[PDB]
Design a protein around this ligand. Structure first.
Ligand code: HEM
Length: 154
């Protein structure tokens, strides 16, 4: 799979809006992930004690991590598919240290799409959402291939 330049433009256009408030978007996305698929929170020993959305919103540490997550993803998206170097450390830690199955990367992709759809309707219409999904599917495809090379393919 390969995105067209037009599709990358739709992806980077909405991401530029996300970048106006990376911490806010990171919070919304991680919270949406934990609420929609609670089992994913169990993978974070650092955050699994958080019981409610209120506690999650109040956690400065979770906000910091959300910034770290979206900044790493933004760097990958900005490579427009040429993300082999960026994917290596991410795939290694998530496959070997954190043990995050592809299914959970699908769940966070769903959360990212939900939050962008909610916050940026004008810049996240059907075509833009389709382009973002394509970019995230490409990332997941390549991450899954790297997982397999690393001995996890989970
Ligand atoms: C858009 C997808 C994601 C990105 C870009 C991402 C990025 C990162 C980054 C940059 C770090 C810090 C450095 C590292 O350990 O590699 C990290 C740590 C971690 N990630 Fe992810 N991650 C993603 C999805 C997930 C998901 C879905 C889970 C769990 C279901 C997960 C669980 C973890 C855990 C447990 C850590 C360590 C947290 C800590 O204790 O500090 N990640 N992630």
């Amino acid at each position: 799979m390969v995105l067209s330049e037009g599709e990358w433009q739709l992806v980077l256009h909405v991401w530029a809006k996300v970048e106006a408030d990376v911490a806010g978007h990171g919070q919304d996305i991680l919270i949406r992930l934990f609420k929609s698929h609670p089992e994913t929170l169990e993978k974070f020993d650092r955050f699994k004690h958080l019981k409610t959305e209120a506690e999650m919103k109040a956690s400065e540490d979770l906000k910091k991590h959300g910034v770290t997550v979206l900044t790493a993803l933004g760097a990958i998206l900005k490579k427009k598919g040429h993300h082999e170097a960026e994917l290596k450390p991410l795939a290694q830690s998530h496959a070997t240290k954190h043990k995050i199955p592809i299914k959970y990367l699908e769940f966070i992709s769903e959360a990212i799409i939900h939050v962008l759809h909610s916050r940026h309707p004008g810049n996240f219409g059907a075509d833009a959402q389709g382009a973002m999904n394509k970019a995230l599917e490409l990332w997941r495809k390549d991450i899954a291939a790297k997982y397999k090379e690393l001995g996890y393919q989970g």
